[PDB]
Amino acid sequence: MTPEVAVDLFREALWLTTVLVAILVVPSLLCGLLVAMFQAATQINEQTLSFLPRLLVMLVTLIVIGPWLLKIFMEYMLSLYTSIPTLIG
């Protein structure tokens, strides 16, 4: 196993992590920007009508995405655990 292979593996891991985090988070970030809209229209300097919609949209995004995110992760894990005995040597 070459350091090149270790970099391969960590590029898999980190790209999967960043795409999962984007997929899960960006809608919550957008709803945060939209409650920022709302608080900027009328000068509502508030602290939590910006958190509640973000959490609701995060949980809705988890529920919606759900199975196919789980499938992506499952066969990433399956790729890793089937290729282990080859990349060992």
């Binding site: 891991a13 899960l24 990433y76 282990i84 060992i88």
Partner: protein, 196 residues
């Protein structure tokens, strides 16, 4: 008392198996209490199952003729050393062997290991730790992905101080159940160990 269990950890499969299982217990949710006492037993049963051909050959060449008061404490012990010797040779990387031949500085033996076996055992265990940490981090990576996704989602929720390990534990368990987890890992251990 501890002389007899020693030569079993060093020469047999026990090392890389218990190491991969310790990585797992750490790779998995922070949980302890798979207790390393059922992990030791599970790794020892896997060692028996994997050494089945090696121990079969040992019983063939050493113990089959030595139920009959043939000989004691002599060459039969080397006839028993031969099978485990070539087995270990099959898995020690070339680099460790070169290095220990270099450190012994004895008569040149580029052909298989020195007969005392004293300079193949440590090379075997070194290559053993190397491969065990290989597989360990290999199976550790996706659990790291889960840890990072969980922590980044929680922080992106403005919801800090929730200790994302306690929320990542059930997702780690779930993913380790869905991909079937344990058969994958035990098959990987018992297949990458010998020639298939």
């Amino acid at each position: 008392l501890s002389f007899i269990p020693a030569f079993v950890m060093l020469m047999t499969s026990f090392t890389r198996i218990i190491i991969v299982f310790s990585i797992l217990r750490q790779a998995l949710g922070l949980q302890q209490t798979p207790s390393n006492q059922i992990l030791t037993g599970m790794a020892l049963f896997l060692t028996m199952f994997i050494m089945a051909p090696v121990f079969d050959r040992v019983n063939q060449d050493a113990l089959q003729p030595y139920l009959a008061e043939k000989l004691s404490a002599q060459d039969a012990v080397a006839k028993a050393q031969v099978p485990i010797k070539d087995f270990m040779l099959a898995q020690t990387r070339t680099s460790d062997l070169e290095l220990f031949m270099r450190l012994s500085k004895r008569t040149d033996i580029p052909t298989p290991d020195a007969a005392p076996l004293t300079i193949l055992v440590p090379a075997f265990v070194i290559s053993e730790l190397k491969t065990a940490f290989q597989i360990g981090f290999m199976i550790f990576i996706p659990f790291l992905i889960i840890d990072l996704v969980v922590a980044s989602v929680l922080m992106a929720m403005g919801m800090m101080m929730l200790s994302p390990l306690i929320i990542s534990l059930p997702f780690k368990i779930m993913l380790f159940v869905l991909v079937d987890g344990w058969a994958l890992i035990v098959g990987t251990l018992a297949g990458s160990f010998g020639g298939v």
